[model samples]
Target: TLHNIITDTENVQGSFSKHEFQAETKKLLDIVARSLYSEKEVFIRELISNGSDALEKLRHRMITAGGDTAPMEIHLQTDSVKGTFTIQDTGVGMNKEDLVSNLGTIARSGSKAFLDALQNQAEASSSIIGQFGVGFYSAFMVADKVEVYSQSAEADAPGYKWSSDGSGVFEVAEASGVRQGTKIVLHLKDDCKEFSSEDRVKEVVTKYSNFVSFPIFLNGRRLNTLQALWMMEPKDISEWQHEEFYRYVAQAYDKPRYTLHYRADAPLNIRSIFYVPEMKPMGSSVALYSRKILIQTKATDILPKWLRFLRGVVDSEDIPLNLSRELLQESALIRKLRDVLQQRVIRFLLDQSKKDPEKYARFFEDYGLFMREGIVTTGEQSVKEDIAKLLRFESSALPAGQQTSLMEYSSRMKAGTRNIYYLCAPNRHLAEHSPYFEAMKDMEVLFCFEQFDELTLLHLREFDRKKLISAETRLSSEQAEDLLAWMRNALVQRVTNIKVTPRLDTHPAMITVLEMGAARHFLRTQQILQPTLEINTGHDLIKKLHALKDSNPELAQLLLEQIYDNAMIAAGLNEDPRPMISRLNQLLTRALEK
Candidate 1:
């Protein structure tokens, strides 16, 4: 009896050649869950930015159209289920189909139809904040209802309102306060109350839309801006255009010194713009942008440690957004890009030095430390020499204060000389008188300088077939040997070796280590290395100390300690010199007391 009326089908299974039923309410289904919660909160970015995109377009249109327009702005006001938002741009407004009535219209963006036209769309208009689209429905994440208001900035056109509860169909009506370019108001879900609060609304806007190219205002008002200057053709950007971009990118006040706009494709897609500031000031290096979206603020991977001082942006569509924004999804290609950027940077610097040498000399003087760091930090030999081609140093061959590169010095070298000699000292005259400078009485040794610089040149080993030899000083003798023995015993464990150098004429002493670079490598750590102390027998201090050794043995030991400390300072120990102040005073007393 139960089966009598209800009985019917059995074994209902079929594979049909023709498709019948296709999808459920998939448009709504995809809208509801395809995007997921990981960033459902991020729809605020997608919409608030639509305001900026529209405003930026308006700005261009007004300037291009040669039209004088009134002040334009955006506002956010939240009240319970109804949240009111407004944007007034004196530029491009809207008409009917432009209002998402033509959801097929990719032009005003009801849909991001990448269909088969992905390539055309991406390059077509670059302002879905760059990709240029309307991520309109992304707003549906919190809103049960949304109403977009628009009017044409073109001619005098009546404003239109398109409202939807998103149960599917939307209703259109005449609207105002879209009296501006475009404004949107949302009827938020009761469960989504957080988005309706002023603080919560602002926190979301501040987090996601902080860099919108136009000013964004809530109750108090905030402003910010970014452009993919790297993506633009260098020629289209006038000589003056970069000043604003640099100031924006670096958040810097000073004008950039060396601005490099580099575009390349073979090694990997790279459109990078760089600024070596007029100041040798700071870091976080270069910023990362992919598809015009900011990826990393200070991307160390895109730049090598040697280029840690460079500033600006690197945009490569080849880089995928890390599931997290700032990290990398693939490192192998990033390394190739890093190598590419560094090579281009060195070449740019090398070119800068040659093109307007006087300007570059100042740039080099301030920023050369970085190039030197670049040289020693890399393992590749070719890169080291390529960078050495950019180094600047004062030369004995040039007039006082004039500087030139190792390449120039190598070119100017006397016919028989093969070794490129360099000395570390305060300035030219002192550099000319440095003990090693005298050994060669040198024809243009690059006088490099201060606290510790020998290591890089030393690590550099060679540039342009000639060896990079440091003029770090050395020497021998007998009564001097006897005197050296007395000081070696008097000094503490630091005396690895002590000798007399006839090489001295005025300076009392100097120190030597077998590997000066490695010696300095130790200086940074707690390790103190033993270095030979060479005394100048001809020096008055040495002559006086020898006489006092027997006459006043106590004073002689004090002078020896004083001489060793002085020698260590000369060695660029940069050690605390305070420990020897009392000894220096005691030696001064002996001299003044005499």
Candidate 2:
């Protein structure tokens, strides 16, 4: 029947508008319901959204109205016995005329009209979601009838009840004791009881609306508890508060090793908190929020993989509430957000290192590998060098157990010198005595003890225009040239070539390759390359080997093999040197017997 769906003559509170529903409204309701299939789950989100929109409207209104403002919240009450659903909010309530048109008029957006009205007033109207016209209609898909109890934010505005009977008609009647907002009730269809239970709707709300910037209550208990601690000023929040904040965000029992609260208005209005967990930690590893809603649980694109160990939240105003994994990666703004966040994190870490060298060194002990990883994995030299500042190495010039960063080492570099020397060994004692370090012993060098440090340094070939040269990469001399020529034939396929060492005085021989980090490469892949053997021409061992080459060919050959295998062990290329023990014993017996 084409008839009036709303009237206010009984209360005579206002004149009746030309608002009525046609017979087609029945088809409209069915069309709205049918368009949604397994999509019935959308109803909870729609009302929650409508409520959020209302609360946001009240927020702006009260900003100017000024007083002790009311707490804005949405309460969802569900009862399975009656299959009843109610979402109530304390927000900008609707008056009778708004009740008639905003609801009684179908497919006409209430939120859109309100949003358009405020477009000239301010820029941040995105807090209000939905094109409301059909959003409110989404309720009909789950419920047979819907009711709205609303009161205006205007002074002492009377409360009113607007009820829908699913027959394309709605009635407006006066109701006493209505609060200062809208309360929507839904009589859930028998088949849609999925939402009539607490846990069911709890899951639904959490999935769709858990991240909305307002508080939501299920039955009586609050639903959302975790705050966007990143949203607050770094100065406003206390350290003790972050203890729980970090725990909640990282979901770990251990306290964070370092807490960084970074906020900026420029470069995408970023507010972020990144925490370094103790020696550990992955699900996006960090949470991303837009305005206050969770955009991504594990936000991969926001931070680089080298920073995967960090756990915290990144909430930025520039991120749209309407984001997806696809758009998250696709948007140029997303990339900008990512780069800005990375630089912020990198700068923050550098500050920490400068502030407390001891604390940062301890952190570097555990996390330096990741820093090295960034350099090795990244293609950009700028980012590689930026990451290098976080790296720590044992310097030959510094005291034992002391570590120096590439930045400090470069600053301390001698004038006119361009090489930053480094040598890889498992420990300082081994590194200091290694044939490789003996050549660079008089100069400044970094002793890389960690397993992957060499590979990392090689990847980051140069820092601040200074070339990184491994001590093993540089060597030479002459009687050693004769010794080297003889060894090339003596060592066979095991040695690609041989040479004399100028500075290797103590060690008889050492292994080097034209391309370095092969030790590390072979460590991971069990592959080896043609290696060069450099000898100490002045060492008694080499002289003895030479004389023995003619004096006792058998013993000299055995001694040469021992040197080759020993060098292999030193280079970390040999998985086992056990086979060399018998040769070494044989040589020992040869000496003992004589």
Candidate 3:
């Protein structure tokens, strides 16, 4: 049957005609082949999208004509040894004149007047993809030669074949035994032989056209089985469906911990399904799409960089795809869409935190770094506080392993207290044993265990009209100015100033800083002046130090230096404690001498 069809072309009804492309059309062809798309694989996506459009046109025509319809689908075949790739679709095929105008001419779209309107208005231009009529030309990016066989569905229409090498000239001729639709066969370039691999073609179909409205078959096997869950009604989607979809997009075996199915008409027509994976992801997982066609995978701009941990897809018809459809035309409209999605996600998490504190705590433990990143990286002060609300920390008032938010900390603050206090350490035990915690014993303190917690709070600066202050900087009542002057000279190299304090009940000394968190960060990164040291006058070490100043100055200096190093270690200012090993050994040796 195939040989008869090929040989029967000699009995066709019409004569062949040859035509040359216009100058501008040739230039545009060159652009498509060399510069338009960043990846050669996008040719498959472009052809598939064009196929879908043709099918849609046929559907509209069938509605008006009330005629019988053929099965609307796309089929792909790859021949590796032959170095060919073919895609066929049963849709509205083009006649001779239609092929000449649509394919031979550049910028002459199906709706020329519509293209003119888009060109006239710059603001409206970026929203629509494939309206510029150049998407089909993208085939030249990967092919050395292309042949299109089309048979119109209209009554008494003759089938035709168009062939081109994309080098400014093409030929159209009558062809017999053509199917009622369009079939494109590409003679792929030697370097692009990979496109002829069945496995590679299937991967591209599943990636860019998985949610396409029509069924797509590759090598006689259906490829796109997963439905476009984001576009469907939330009530119709089941728990199992969500789990299955989550596993597909996130490529994880575990089920989603939380799923958000959101659709909005105003602000922007957005259909999105976001999943909080049960475990932290290795990298970004969200994909951006327009009209069910993927625009970007591992999309970073669709959401803030901090939200990269979220795994899902966002499909919006209103997004403006560029000429290549590989990137979005950056505009204020994009910012509005991002803002809307961000606010929705934030509100969802806040509600979830209230409904089940234990589960939310576990989520925070896994993905809380993203929240801290949002707080520290966002420029708006209000946004900072909004993200700060999600941050949780162990509290002095709560039992071990329990965490509380900034809002909860603010609510429990004592009356007339104008500042919120926090102390950073490695764990609950270290936090509770911190010398700085002694100053705020009567007040509640937030315990920060993560490395970025201090930096995040420093950027937050304030929450609920209360300043966020490090516990190390909060000074207590001064004590014995004369005793402070003696200790100031004893450890002059280790401290900027030595002041006696009434805050401590157990610790001998602690570091006080104007910008404690920033100072610690800078000291770890650069050389800077040492922070002022405050001594607990009520502690027995201070009284003994005061006596040793006159009795044993050498031993007193060694103890003072050792105490200063201990303070720096407690404050997290010492990056390399290896240098202190010898000094610590000397202090122990002197103390144990007979």
Candidate 4:
């Protein structure tokens, strides 16, 4: 009977008054409809946020007034065939005057006024999310007509109904026998009929309001069961709870490798939970929230780009936002927040590295590329060094397969050593046999295996006030200059300059460049001039080649070319070795025939 009465407009009895919005209300409504929100679905979030705010007001009132209050909850109902969507909340309802002043007045936010009052009273209003008064007008973005029916929670207050088409005027009237809450019915437009589906409504709620403080029910079924894990005390949460929350936020299946539940009140009010996923994610997995409402999914600039591998949620109440709450406004505050979080994560990792070196070693093996990138891209020198401390490399002084850090290497440097040396090779075997290693044998040298390691070190330039030098630059010899002149002419196209060096014991020669890392990078991208070759004068190959050059120029030329190509391969500067296969086979055949 009540449903029929609600549908029959003829039987409705109330005093109706049509009022024009203030002079600027129409302009504001147009902006809200066309440009205020980036996405149409956010209208639902705004409405739900308003309802949650109302419920929170009632909760505070009950705490102070010491009276019985109705159960607090949000209910959403959708009817596709009728093209109608309804949202109801058992919150602190409004009387007729309150409805006219709060809903009819454009640009006046009841939530903002309520928050100011609470602050004046020294009451906590942190739970309230609706700061701007424009959220209610967002409904007109999708709805052709919106209606509100509310009855005050006060025992003697009268009920009221408000209706608007958002053209210019709205109608309000007094209604009888209304419940002590607010109910909103949206007559969706033709293009927005999607919101009239139960599934669509549930999806929007789950995405934006899934962690609202109050329970949310949709079509008699509960939707928001997942707790706001970031807001809870870290000590109270169990490992199982963390695993569940991490999987939900990350949209992943595997459990977190490490979890960081951090909260801070100073600098900025922040509640965040960071999870190191079991596997590297394809892109940034963190989302930014404010007061439990999502601001941006896969948020950018909230953390340094190198931290994109981290998965988590960051909620800060102190972050200033534009009117739409879509874009952040305070660049300085954002940077400070980012710096704080970055430092915390870095300290956590460093502590883990100290507590269990072996466990952190595995994490470094998987996610170390991001740290290396951070070192290379970060402009601040102090930040660069901080990131550099996490790097690990195999050291010649340590047993094979064991890793050491730059700090350790710097600590063990010789009394007079002012530079940190490193040699890049494909493996430990090749590195140990390298002629550059021969020259730096007495000093400690780091072994680099990754293709980007050399570039990273070059970008770093120095660590702990010590210059980072490539071992290739330390090669020199006092052998016959005539021998180098002959070899340079023999391999004119391949060798930029040739000089004899005593830095070789087992190898014939090695390549040297002003910037070996830059040379390797240039070779990978485009053609580069040949690097200078330093010959090992004491080696048998150099002796035999020196003697045969003048006697058999043709055969000796092939051997010189083969030797130059070999040096290029060892330097990691050779992009294509196919061109040298034919010359190498001929040299081997001639040697076998001899």
Candidate 5:
């Protein structure tokens, strides 16, 4: 039965007390109406969010009281013919007293207080919407007139209606036939009548409120088909939920292999659920958002770019939404949030490594590039060191596709090994096969596959008080003299100076940087560095070449040139293979012709 509660009640009319808000409130509301809430279209989202909040509050209250209010939800109805739209929530509804206190006047607006705080924080242009209760008034941005009819959750309270056009004065009238909760009817502006259409309303709701925690109905049709799985406990969420969510977000039918639903309450409140889809490079959609609103999807400033494979939502009450609703404004709070979240993600990955080394190694094989990048670009040295913990690479100590981190590599370092050594190559096979890598085989050599790894390590420069030395160039004093003598006599005509090897082992010769700073800059700037050649005195090939230096100088020169070019290839500087192929053919032809 439709209850005409207010009309049935005794009529008691009294003079309504009217008052003017503080001057700052007028200015603040002006800013909200124009500068902040300039986009009229988002009013739908704002109102829907408020209704969702109301429903959530009701759900919380009902559970607290042991009430059977499980069906309390949010629903919408659109009528194009009548040019009307209705958003209703079965929440703690407002009676005449609530209508007067909550709606008749915006007392707890936080506007005047916000303005006073703004005076103190004048340098910081922090908006008050996220920090204030003024979210309800955002409806006026779209509605020419808004009428709210509500019945209190209590059975005996009279229902009341509040009407406003946002020009300062609002009227309260006793409402008849009101439901048990709130129903807001937006007399959408003439230009925004499209919202009154069923299709348009459905699209907006599905876009923004699909993750909302209540059943939303558009024209009596249920929207929000997918649950907000991120907010749920990690253990409560099933693997199938993650797989399906990933597919929906990825727009592909393929399933995700790794799902990380990270929730932390310490330091910063962060609820993030990220998935690593089945072995595919992400195509630029992994930015950040607050409540489904896009905010810098390419925000490398937030998550380490190596985490680009992560596809999911990270909603924190800490992140401040910007005026455009598409970006996130920076604050000290957000910086703290970024640090906490980045560290948590890194720790999670390291935990993954510890839980299942083989599976984590496979993950590193596919997505380790991002972790390497984080080490280079994160700027904070300590944070970079933390990120380095998750890095995996083919090491001299491990077999192919097997990996180890700097921290672990440090522990296994030779007693006198003073520096961490690494080599950049296309793959583990090539790295292991390279002359430079072979020369540094005795040292713990990290195999780097990406171009950025070299750059990243160069930027990292050192970790744990030990220098990170590129195996491509390191020299020792004793072998230096022999190298200089060999270069002067045998390859004087074809090349530059030769030096002793500090980072060589198995190979006959390696390379070094005569000028450390210049070589690093050159490597970073041109991706090409003029390196000092190092001939290994202990190797049989070098002993034979030294012996043949005087007898067959031409042959020795040819071999020296070939070796230099080979080092260049190993260093990942040489691009064209035709020259190396031609040189190899000439040497092979010369040997065969003899």
Candidate 6:
């Protein structure tokens, strides 16, 4: 199977000869050198990947053709004295013609076709980097000058050397005593001499290429010891492997609480390992990236922003990289990939919730902010709704500190219940005591403890077309009439209206904005809007207050107005409590004296 070069029978000599770039290649090269990779260090990943690909090809040839091709491996040799970084691959070598065609010419195999396909499938295609086939040129990111020496696999083929400073033209000439594989020497640029340091180069290699299939020898010592566990079957990955992987990816001492390793071919070929860590980041933006390159340390865009608390690797064969393998171009395939990953992550979380509710509650307590963020940032309503379902909150029906989701709350809703009620409070104690909570007692209600919960719910607007009404605001018509009659004679000067709460059970009375939209807007205002008060008819306080209003209207008015103010403060709509505080003291003293 030792095959020599087979020139195309129809190829004319002139047609295969060297040609100058159609445009000024130097100008384009400059743009690529600076802007192609987001960071200059990506050159290490690009060069190592190119070398790995060469070794893979050689391995294939060795197996298929029974060639005594030497074992394929990548070796990194750094010479600080010479300020050179050498990456050698025992793979398919290049002859003089191969050097000219492959190095001097832009013979990117699939770029044009990929672009065409992209245009046709503009709706489905993503940004594609593999198509550009410009990985080799990325060496320019670090090197002032790059040199390649190789001898073709054919025994009769002569060795050749190609050299370029990434200017307009490159030089290719015949060589002697060259290796049977490829050797690339990069003369480090003054600014990039760090790459010549053993430790620095090793760091980049381990960060981006540690999972490469072939053995990577850094200065004759093997690097890339860890396998790409995400590519393997879930069962094949050992428990210890997951623990180690999580520690490596998350950079956390705490082990992962949950690991979801998933791969799929549809909706774009994807391989990912996601972890819900035992500890969440102190802040919202702690997630990182480990693609073939570390594109972003905080790759918030990789997963839904809501999943930012999760740390892991999502290596998709479909990510589109530019010529420098740095920036991702916006395309349909990327969107599809993003959508698929988010859906998978959401499904995983949902599954985990079902698998162990108690453990999931711990997760929610630690990282629930991300879910709230998703409810606010995500554009698609359906996706936001799904994320909203993942949200946990203490419910009027559940024990304190226990939480339930809207789906769960909805499931327990009485027949003919058309709305989901929720009350936002600082904590369980305040929530249980909240006039708003009391107002929502009879109705199935959720208690949101986070500061942003109310706003998040507002943005979510509705879930499954069922509006999320503030527990204090969803009042019954009969309740409204009776409360209004009592308030008209009692605190008519303060309250706009008084009513019975359809949602209330435990609270004596609660305040609600007359218009739903106006209520939410009112809460955001400096001066709280006076809400229509809802009295819990079941509570004895309201019955006594009504009688008090009829008997001693002056005293009843003071107590009534104070209660309304108290309700506003509980709803987070009230700003200053100075006036309410004084009234509360007076009311307590009067009650004691009586």
Clashes in model 3: which pairs?
A: none
Q: What tens-digit string does per-residue lDDT give for candidate 2 at 460-579?
A: 999888898878862135545555677888767667867665767667777765444554555566424667777777777887777677678777888888888877776656757777
lDDT of 4 at 114: 87
Each prediction's RMSD over C-alphas, in Å, is 9.8, 11.3, 12.7, 11.8, 13.2, 11.5
Tens-place lDDT per residue, model 6, 184-287, is 99999998999899999898888677676678898999875777778679999998999987887777787889888888776656677888778656122333
lDDT of candidate model 1 versus the reference: 0.67
Q: Ten consecutive residues with minimal summed lDDT in candidate 6?
A: 282-291
Mind giving the per-residue lDDT tens digits that candidate 1 earns over 348-446? 887887789999988877777877787778877888888778877777677877777787888888788688888755444346544466677536678
Q: What is the TM-score of each candidate against the true structure?
A: 0.64, 0.68, 0.74, 0.79, 0.67, 0.70
Candidate 5, residue 135: Cα displacement in angstroms equals 2.0
Candidate 1 deviant stretches above 4 angstroms? 1-45, 48-134, 142-144, 149-182, 187-245, 260-273, 282-308, 313-345, 355-362, 365-388, 392-404, 409-485, 525-530, 538-540, 587-594
The lDDT of each candidate is: 0.67, 0.77, 0.81, 0.82, 0.67, 0.71
Clash-forming residue pairs, model 2: 284-298
Candidate 3 lands at a TM-score of 0.74
Residue-level error in angstroms, candidate 3, position 563: 18
- In model 2, where is the ten-residue run with the lowest total lDDT? 320-329
Instruction: Report the Cα lDDT for residue 536, model 5.
Output: 71
Off by over 4 Å in 5: 1-21, 24-30, 56-71, 107-131, 249-253, 282-306, 317-333, 354-361, 393-404, 425-449, 471-594
Q: Please tell me which predicted candidate would have the highest lDDT against the true structure.
A: 4
Tens-digit lDDT track of model 3 for 424-542? 76556446655578667599999887768988988999998899988877222333555577777666665787766666887788776553355545555754555778788777777
Ranking by TM-score: 4, 3, 6, 2, 5, 1
* Model 5 TM-score, all chains together: 0.67
For all candidates, the clash counts are 7, 1, 0, 1, 5, 12
Residue 283, model 1: lDDT of: 30
lDDT of each residue in 407-505, candidate 4, tens digit only: 889989978978999987656655765666877747989998766788789899988889998888821232356677777676766567776666677
Best by TM-score: 4
- Error in Å for residue 333 of model 4: 1.6
